[PDB]
Amino acid sequence: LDPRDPLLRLSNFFDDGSVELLHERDRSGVLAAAGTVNGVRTIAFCTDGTVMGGAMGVEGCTHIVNAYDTAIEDQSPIVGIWHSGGARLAEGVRALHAVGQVFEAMIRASGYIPQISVVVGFAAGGAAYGPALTDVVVMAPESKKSGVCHIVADDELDAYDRGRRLVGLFCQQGHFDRSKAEAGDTDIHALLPESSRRAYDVRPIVTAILDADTPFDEFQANWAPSMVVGLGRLSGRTVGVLANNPLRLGGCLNSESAEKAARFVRLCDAFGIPLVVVVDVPGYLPGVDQEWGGVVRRGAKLLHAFGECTVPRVTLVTRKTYGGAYIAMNSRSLNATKVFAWPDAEVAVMGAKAAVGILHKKKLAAAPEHEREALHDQLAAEHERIAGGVDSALDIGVVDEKIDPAHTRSKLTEALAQAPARRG
Amino acid sequence: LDPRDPLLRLSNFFDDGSVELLHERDRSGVLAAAGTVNGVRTIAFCTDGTVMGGAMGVEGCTHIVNAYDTAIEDQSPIVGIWHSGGARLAEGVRALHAVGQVFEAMIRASGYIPQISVVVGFAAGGAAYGPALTDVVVMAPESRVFVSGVCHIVADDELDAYDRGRRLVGLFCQQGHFDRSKAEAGDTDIHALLPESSRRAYDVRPIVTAILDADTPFDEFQANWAPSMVVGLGRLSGRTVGVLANNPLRLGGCLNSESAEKAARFVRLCDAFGIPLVVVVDVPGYLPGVDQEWGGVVRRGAKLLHAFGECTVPRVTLVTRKTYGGAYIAMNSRSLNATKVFAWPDAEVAVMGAKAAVGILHKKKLAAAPEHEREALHDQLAAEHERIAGGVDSALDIGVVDEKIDPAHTRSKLTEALAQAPARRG
Ligand SMILES: O=C(O)Cc1ccc(Oc2cnc3cc(Cl)ccc3n2)cc1
Ligand SMILES: O=C(O)Cc1ccc(Oc2cnc3cc(Cl)ccc3n2)cc1
């Protein structure tokens, strides 16, 4: 068969021998089907790249809409395998309208059933907006639109495998299992640099926290890189992770990392996936020539996302959480389920020397020039004696517990396990 | 510091004699009061610019939250007057936590009661995100937000800021009803404001204001941001309506990242508060970013589809001149469950212009033509593509346009369809 054969692609994605067409095969450029993905009933449609390059027409779209109606009624996940130049120019507005009805089915399914898009060939026009309306997009390299794609696979068959694993993360979420959690505990603090000033890649820490025998499905890895988000499993339970990555921009929030984080929070809240929020944030950055508009609009959306969130969400402060960004990274004010901190963590408005410079500016300015840098250094010292660390914040109430890093998984798992499935 | 006194500001804004303080005055930096705005019971709080520059502390933030809880429980609009350089640094993390509680309260009220911000002085850090979380932000010229599209309305001065803020309380909380007799009394040949040439640009805003009531302001939002897309509140036979209109005077009226994002916010906002939408469409395509980045238009284009698709208030579409391709779908089309779709008689509903389509469907019949005749061949080929495609008559057949209307009854036909649709469903 041709590699682009739709029934070939539906068969590679589904469990062997499980495919069951939902309509007679034809020249419409779409084939839809019921199958299983590791036992889960799944609906899937494939565009037929062999007919008119997969251009969508009235009858192809009517198959997709029917497949959505089938999947909405079964409460089944629906997977779309995409390879299409867009709408069929010759069918005119009728095809435009039918493509519109595809979007309207995707909007109806939104947050109801999970929707995965596996993009395996050229995808343009209505065939780029289609996937943009689903929850997760997997793109085979065989296919400039930054932020739109979530997971880049190695190739067409690797794309079907990540797509299969997404189905299992969304419809086979599991229970937290306190006993596996403690079997996996390690000293995650060891992965930190000995200098609090040195930068590091936070992904090893995300990898330490999550189960050893399961991949970490990082979303949008190359877009907004000061922020890491993705799905994984924590003691067998599907969890969503969000983590400032101090290797990029010093781990600060900005307009794009706020958007990446906020869209992910909303996605997990929609399907009941609890969140682990690993925090190491020194502040936030503006735009390209100093425009705060994006970080204000996008940062508000991030607040809104955590604010309205209703799944368990637990925060772990590894090193430092400063100022306005402290609030946005799932803080107590915004109803975080629990807030943990590693023993050496700092919860402050800014650095101690930066904060003394402002708080005692008049004092500092009145002092002789041959004693300022000496008084500033010492003023900063008594400042950290009363502020800065976990002990201050524990007393205020914004950190619930100082935890030994060797017990991060247990503490996180236990905190997640006693929240309700909803309300926060 | 008289100019900036909270109780003076709180009363230049409320109805004369209505201010009832919610707590006893102090030096916290916030005064919160009850009162009325043209009769509507309203809560309001003012940061105290004459105390530490209005810097926000634990006890001023608690006033704002109790103000929010009062307004939420009374189902009353809550107006914030902002002048503050940020959180009190001497209060440390206690104040960060208290600022966040203000945010959380603004998020609880979201969609539920209207929230209007009047930014009268500088507003930075914590006091910049406050307004960012509310529904409409008014800004007087003697101020700024710092730490664009963040600010919806620019005022002529502080007293004008309070005046525009008071109209907004009245637009959200005194929505009125439609009136067939008033609507017809306002009909005009709206088609006459177009240019006679089908490719000239025009400012859409005289069209909009000729649909809305003849002497009621049109409170445009974000006019200098994403200017290929006009949105705002006005009144239509006396009922509050929201308007979205493509503006052919900027970027040919196309959609792009900012215009899609502009429309999607505004649609979700009218939907939350029960405000019908009038979508005036004249859109020929959509455009990528400066470096040919389509990521913006895709993500934010999709959010527009989602806004209209999930929308439940009556939303009527009028095709003035042309509507093309993917932008046609997103601009409140039948496929997204528009309440009703009207077109003026000359309008075009097509995948693309006839010459564009014929250039693709017949790339090879034209490339093979002799150069001096390949054009007569293009124009005759296009003329027969539009004996079939593009017109309002074809679109009525397909069923994507519900009625072709005389432009002289635009206002009364839009009113009628909004009035007779269910208040929810769609
Ligand atoms: O497939 C083709 O050749 C024609 C085509 C192109 C795109 C499209 O879908 C959409 C969806 N949403 C959109 C939002 C915006 Cl703001 C702008 C454009 C949008 N276009 C449907 C059909
Ligand atoms: O008041 C001061 O002087 C310090 C201050 C500054 C900002 C702030 O509030 C917020 C809210 N949301 C935010 C979202 C992002 Cl993504 C980044 C920063 C954010 N900051 C609270 C306090």
UniProtKB/TrEMBL annotation, chain B:
Enzymatic class: transferase
One GO biological process term: fatty acid biosynthetic process
Pathway entry: Lipid metabolism; fatty acid biosynthesis; Lipid metabolism; mycolic acid biosynthesis
UniProt name for this protein: Biotin-dependent acetyl-/propionyl-coenzyme A carboxylase beta6 subunit
MF annotations from Gene Ontology: propionyl-CoA carboxylase activity; transferase activity
Presence of the UniProt keyword Transferase in the record: yes
Reactions catalysed according to its record: N(6)-carboxybiotinyl-L-lysyl-[protein] + acetyl-CoA = N(6)-biotinyl-L-lysyl-[protein] + malonyl-CoA; N(6)-carboxybiotinyl-L-lysyl-[protein] + propanoyl-CoA = methylmalonyl-CoA + N(6)-biotinyl-L-lysyl-[protein]
E.C. number: 2.1.3.15
Keywords: Fatty acid biosynthesis, Fatty acid metabolism, Ligase, Lipid biosynthesis, Lipid metabolism, Transferase
Family: Belongs to the AccD/PCCB family.
Matching InterPro entries: AccD/PCCB (IPR051047), AcCoA_carboxyl_beta (IPR034733), ClpP/crotonase-like_dom_sf (IPR029045), COA_CT_C (IPR011763), COA_CT_N (IPR011762)
Domain CoA carboxyltransferase C-terminal residues, every copy: 185-426
GO cellular component, one term: acetyl-CoA carboxylase complex
Domain CoA carboxyltransferase N-terminal: 1-184
